[PDB]
Swiss-Prot record, chains A, B:
Enzymatic class: hydrolase
Impact after mutating residue 226 to C: In MLD; juvenile-onset
Reactions performed catalytically: an N-acyl-1-beta-D-(3-O-sulfo)-galactosyl-sphing-4-enine + H2O = a beta-D-galactosyl-(1<->1')-N-acylsphing-4-enine + sulfate + H(+)
Name this polypeptide is given: Arylsulfatase A
Length: 483, 483
């Protein structure tokens, strides 16, 4: 019998946000304990620094550019979404007799009759928002009780964010200070049912947590010490705790594999209400460490030895890793990941020796922007980001345009993870030997990988906006059904 | 019977260097365990971001500007040093019947016949270099065995660094790849003797560790994963381990209070071979968090509850804290510190509510550069530093000259410890109320504190350079006695 997999996927969390990762004020008790009793990756990456592509790669285990999950992210009125031909981790496990279930943010397309929603991609049960919770007007919405409004107002001219239970709207807009509660409930039931069915569950908890606007329940409002972002993180931390408790009460501790990560770097344009990359450079939207290197914590008593690994690993490896643990047959499609089970089980090292990064807006001409092999990371193309704005380092700002590099900026991450000192900026046979390998790795991938038809380029059709009242007037303002 | 105090004082270590503080490659096993089994301060500060003044404040418990320990640091040919009228933590404990002992860097003056050396300031035994180990030519010196030279060559035109055993030279220059060994030996003996004398020991371990040039024994050379700086840190970590072991073998675990800290922020001009402030801003020489906020770890089983405190605390508080634990009578002099024992013993909160910072080169006209109260830190004067050069943020570079601020740059460290978003940059009654308190605190201190006669201004007399061969020729090149 395979393990009970629980894959938590935080939204917009930085490398230096968790308490166990070095943040001064952040309050993350449950996660620190999870990290104290299980593996803690120091070098865990994501292929792209954005929600849509990152999430796409997590579920399919393939590079975003293959399935056309570019450029940028999907909006509510988008026509495209994650192709059904693409097999997700949920589909692979479902066939293995798993009771799959998702709670929260999808952001992988909605389409016509909801053809791109979770139920069609492999999940049995679902409860959550089809996209980023800020992609809908939030002027009237309350982020913190009793009646503290959400700052910014979010995206205007759009239908209020709906809370989809499978394929039907349960609320619109859902009460944010209590949205989290519904997810934990949905989780507990999913696990309980799976237990009394003698069936292994797969809980994909994609939290809206630490993505803007920052929201929380009365139990966390001004209770973190780190303000709005802190309160929102404290809730995410509690959510992990309640899940661990629920699993504990069911006696499934040594029979449950828990994984935690974030989809991309901190949106620093959010300032005091945004994440923190820590020592890493820049954040969301950039190919710098601060935008692609996300935290990670493996937990599974009796199988996962408590420690800290520096082995190379990516979210692209989760599908094969989880498939291997479940004994589930791997798909025919060419996966860009590896089986990290040896690393987790402590029976060997990670197969990951090289990493490839693509920008927010990629293209077949330039190709991969950054490539890492061992401790060396080359930067063939550097670019700033609006998401990485307001910081002290000008290399992150949107002002910094796309610049080419020949030879590429070579960084020894083992001694310079902050990417401040370029080696080629001037050599050493070791460095020179690495340069050649990195330049070849790029060329070999660019030639092999072929960009799939851009889904985001399919266009926007406002008629696709999920409305609570079908055939309503005047849309979209008339689509309501609060709690 | 009072506790066995062991005060470790690292040299040039950053906030984000230790593994338990969030560094990706740093290898610090022993220190992480020390931090896992005892208090870990997230907000621990030092009055000035330089060796001499910082160290002066540690031992005397008073602000560097009072005793004239400015401007900058003391050189080998300096005439001044820490005034004997000033009572150190060693003197207070000595009267309490403590077997005081120091190992390593002094950097608090040498003077004429060594009138400023440890033996005159309160230490019974001593073994270490009278100042920074880079303040002497290191072209021929070996930093890493078998024969890997020290980079940079260090300070030229000076007498090679001597290893002073009390008041007499034991070696000059001492073998660096084995200097650490001598200190640990000296420590073990100090503790053993104190034990068989039924007397409490006071071990002040001022390591040269992580100060340039980076050195290490064969047991750490290319063994840290983080290069030269990593190897040097791994040794410092081992040094802490061997001390813990020695204390363990003597059965003095629950009877020994261990404290770890650094004197100032990371010298970033050293680049890949320098420290790391982490999320904090700038480093050594600046009044920014990265230069004044140092790591800290309290350890004392059965008395120190394992946790992480965010309470305000400074190195200025160590003297009174340690004096209180030892039951030792506090000196008549006005101390700028507080008794942190309640915090350590978990019987209460810290008395520290405000912190004051002075620049590398201070003056009576400008006064304190930065003031902190609770979670707000004002910047009345900002300045860069040559020590903080080569970084990405231009506010740290020496290029950034001393600029005044009215109103001062107000930062809410609880949500913005990185000092990126100025509040007054534009308010909130809370902020406005804090501004007034901070502006008053500055004015009240500037008026009260009177600058003591600048010791570093006393001049340089080359005849004061410690020479192995007295009445030698041709000096200083002729002062030798290796191992
Ligand atoms: C999503 O739809 C499925 C049915 O397609 C729901 O599953 C049933 O849920 C009830 C409890 O509400 C159980 O008693 C049934 O055994 C479930 N059937 C199966 C086949 O699993 C599921 O609850 C729905 N979830 C949401 C959030 O709407
Ligand atoms: C520093 O000087 C003191 C004497 O002033 C030395 O102390 C003696 O050390 C020996 C061992 O070497 C002991 O047997 C004596 O009992 C010690 N006497 C006292 C009064 O403590 C000390 O060893 C010297 N240390 C160095 C490093 O030179
Ligand atoms: C709140 O105001 C916004 C415009 O600021 C509008 O879009 C929304 O419909 C209003 N809703 C309520 C409940 O007042
Ligand atoms: C080594 O060379 C330096 C000059 O580069 C000189 O100061 C020193 O005395 C020399 N020592 C030896 C042992 O060669
Ligand atoms: Ca995201
Ligand atoms: Ca120093």
């Amino acid at each position: 019998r395979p393990p009970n997999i629980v894959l938590i996927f935080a939204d917009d969390l930085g490398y230096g946000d968790l308490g166990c990762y070095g943040h001064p004020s952040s309050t993350t008790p449950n996660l620190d304990q999870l990290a104290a009793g299980g593996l803690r990756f120091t070098d865990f990456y994501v292929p792209v620094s954005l929600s849509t592509p990152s999430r796409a790669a997590l579920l399919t285990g393939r590079l975003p550019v293959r399935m056309g999950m570019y450029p940028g992210v999907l909006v509510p009125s988008s026509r495209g979404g994650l192709p059904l031909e693409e097999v997700t981790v949920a589909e692979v496990l479902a066939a293995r007799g798993y009771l799959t279930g998702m709670a929260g943010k999808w952001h992988l397309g909605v389409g016509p009759e909801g053809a791109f929603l979770p139920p069609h991609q492999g999940f049995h049960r679902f409860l959550g928002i089809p996209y980023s919770h800020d992609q809908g007007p939030c002027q009237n919405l309350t982020c913190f009780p009793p009646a503290t409004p959400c700052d910014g107002g979010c995206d205007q001219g759009l239908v209020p964010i709906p809370l989809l239970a499978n394929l039907s709207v349960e609320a619109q807009p859902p009460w944010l200070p209590g949205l989290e509660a519904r997810y934990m409930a949905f989780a507990h039931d999913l696990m309980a049912d799976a237990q009394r069915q003698d069936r292994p569950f797969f809980l994909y908890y994609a939290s809206h947590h630490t993505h803007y606007p920052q929201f929380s329940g009365q139990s966390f409002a001004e209770r973190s010490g780190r303000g709005p972002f802190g309160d929102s993180l404290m809730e995410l931390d509690a959510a992990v705790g309640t899940l661990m408790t629920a699993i504990g009460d069911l006696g499934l501790l040594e029979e449950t594999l828990v994984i935690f990560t974030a989809d991309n770097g901190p949106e620093t344009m959010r300032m005091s209400r945004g994440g923190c990359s820590g020592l890493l450079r820049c954040g969301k939207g950039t190919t710098y460490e601060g935008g692609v290197r996300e935290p990670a914590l493996a937990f599974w008593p009796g199988h996962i030895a408590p420690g800290v690994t520096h082995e190379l690993a990516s979210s692209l490896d989760l599908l094969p890793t989880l498939a291997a643990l479940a004994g589930a047959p791997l798909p025919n499609v060419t996966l860009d990941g590896f089986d990290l089970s040896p690393l987790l089980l402590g029976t060997g090292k990670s197969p990951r020796q090289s990493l490839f990064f693509y920008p927010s807006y990629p293209d077949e001409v330039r190709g991969v922007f950054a490539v890492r092999t061992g401790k060396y990371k080359a930067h063939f193309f550097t670019q700033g980001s609006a998401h990485s704005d307001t910081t002290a380092d000008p290399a992150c700002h949107a002002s910094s345009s796309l610049t080419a590099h020949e030879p590429p900026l070579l960084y020894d991450l083992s001694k310079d993870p902050g990417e401040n000192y370029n080696l080629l900026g001037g050599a050493t046979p070791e460095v020179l030997q690495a340069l050649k390998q990195l330049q070849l790795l790029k060329a070999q991938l660019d030639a092999a990988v072929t960009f799939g038809p851009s889904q985001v380029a399919r266009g926007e059709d406002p008629a696709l906006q999920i409305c609570c009242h079908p055939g309503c007037t005047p849309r979209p303002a008339c689509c309501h059904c609060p709690d």
